[PDB]
Amino acid sequence: KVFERCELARTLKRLGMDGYRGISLANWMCLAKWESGYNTRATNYNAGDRSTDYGIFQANSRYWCNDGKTPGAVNAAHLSCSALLQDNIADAVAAAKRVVRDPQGIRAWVAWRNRCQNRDVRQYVQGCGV
Numbered sequence: 001k002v003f004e005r006c007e008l009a010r011t012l013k014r015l016g017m018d019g020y021r022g023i024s025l026a027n028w029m030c031l032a033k034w035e036s037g038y039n040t041r042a043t044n045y046n047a048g049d050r051s052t053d054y055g056i057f058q059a060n061s062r063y064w065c066n067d068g069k070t071p072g073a074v075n076a077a078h079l080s081c082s083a084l085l086q087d088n089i090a091d092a093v094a095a096a097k098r099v100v101r102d103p104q105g106i107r108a109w110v111a112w113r114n115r116c117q118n119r120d121v122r123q124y125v126q127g128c129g130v
Helices: 005-014 025-036 081-085 090-100 110-115
Strands: 043-046 051-054
Touching: 005 025, 025 110, 051 081, 081 090
Parallel strands: none
Antiparallel strands: 043 051
16 A cells, blocks of 8 residues: 555554654655655565665564564564554554664664755655644
8 A cells, every 4th residue: 555645644643653753744754755655565676685664654573573584584573574564654663663762863864864864854744634
């Protein structure tokens, strides 16, 4: 499923993402935008280390979910990577919450540093009623 902007904003809000570990909804939206373009089926294979990023927040199979084919992989969010390709993003959200409970917080996603950190992210939630 490819979410429309405000549809996603409300979905994330209902899932308890607004202010989770101090992260605003606009930051989560900027992250989802740059990571997957709001596409729940987004996948990106990393030939270099043989891992794959799954779903709307692109969780890496080397550490966050299990797909069985990633060398020396761990499953920190304790989920099958398949769970991160569903239209229902509840599990992807739980995994994203797990990531930010670590010290880096939202900084765990490099794409966030490059295109959301210290930027005007108001546009992601403007007009969505959140």
